[PDB]
Symmetry: none
Subunit: 145 residues, 4 copies
């Protein structure tokens, strides 16, 4: 229901900015992003007070397909790296909710065992988690119809 | 436009045409008392509201996003940030209970049940109602992701 | 959700008439600690006398006859009652987890009208029965 | 204590737990007894005495149907049935074949509510316990309707 979100004291986002800066050409990237080259360097420089805006983070992650800035952003608050999702919702919201209940029922079914949890059963339960996550994401996209 | 085939799933982290982060900002401003939050965040309250308003140029820095999430225990802004680039909501693991798979599964049912509640409701969808079902979706994704990590002990 | 409505068919009146004819009024009245004429008037729809809930429970338990309760339920468009006598030996969360599995299999069916069939109905009914049992046991576990 | 357990053989045994009395207390606390008494056409103090276990007054069958009709709340009927070890009531006057998916999703909501209390670290007060029993009875109601929706 609730979580205790904490801010890590390890420079996850700062170290990610340095790696991103060293991975791509700052000159081309700043032009593609509509930014001045020095401003992009300052926003990636932890020793400079300049910071990215959210749309600047989206654009540079979009233009590069590199989640380094987002992964370090998420690791700064003890969160796992980001997961890309890009599929459309072609069915009604109600159908996605019901299929999510079926996948969750199989996860609960495997969680009460009733048989030895082999490698195949653990993999099938991971697939149910993968499908349940997929049905939940599409449920959210059905709300944007 | 309309004649180039669907070309956005071939690329990762594409900026969505939907204003996910802007909708998340407005829902966040509605839920929390801005005066009390700005006092804890050490910022002016009007500047906080401007950072939550798309029509104003003020925007959050990453340190402020981490701070607001920490202070409110609300991942709405982060989850909207991630939805803006076609990503799943965030999954915190600082409280990961490796031997509590059953707890994560039951908390997933609580979120799925609240999602199901909104789906069968005959009420006109309100932005608050839409975002509460979004939150239930993101909460369910969180419990399911944590369930997978907790599966290692079972 | 539900729009409970009182039926205009006297389902409870006919249940009382069938109950009074089935059992011996003299023995049943003294077994329930009630006057025979009072019991007859409580079963006679033409008489204003009515049963209290304690009197309905007692007569149902004494006779093992759900006729009065089923007619009581049919008066508000409810199905006949279902007795359960199983004990709860397991913890609350174990029942809820097993309830998710049955509801998931029930939710596995439906969704798409296309599969349909009758074999799927039987397994969906089976999941419904197991789910009801898990929910009923959960209520008994709540009385710790 | 040496006679074997035989309560599972006899149906409709009257429970020693005050199921119906607890339901009367929860019903009286949820609705205002002055407005409902006017809708029911009965005296307010007479209505409160029938919902009060420490008072000899009790409801008649027509009064129980009437209140269930006016309130759309099956609390009194479900407590009535639980007193003789019976499942809660299932209304069928709105049963429809095309309502199957709605029945299943409502059951998910009730099971989700029960799942919340089952993982809660806070102590279960009788008000919190009553909300879970309520969700149990509603869930059983939704599951039964799902079975009847298949005919």
């Amino acid at each position: 229901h609730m979580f205790d979100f904490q801010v890590s004291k390890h420079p996850h986002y700062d170290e990610a900015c340095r790696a991103f800066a060293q991975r791509h050409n700052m000159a081309k990237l700043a032009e593609r992003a509509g930014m001045n080259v020095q401003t992009l360097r300052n926003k990636l420089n932890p020793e400079q007070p300049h910071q990215f805006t959210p749309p600047e983070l989206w654009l540079l992650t979009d233009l590069t397909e590199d989640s380094t800035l987002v992964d370090g952003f998420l690791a700064q608050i003890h969160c796992l790296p980001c997961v890309p999702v890009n599929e459309l919702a072609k069915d009604k919201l109600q159908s996605y909710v019901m299929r999510a209940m079926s996948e969750l029922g199989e996860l609960a079914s495997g969680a009460v065992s009733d048989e030895r949890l082999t490698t195949a059963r653990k993999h099938n339960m991971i697939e149910s988690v993968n499908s349940g996550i997929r049905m939940l994401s599409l449920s959210a996209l059905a709300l944007h119809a």
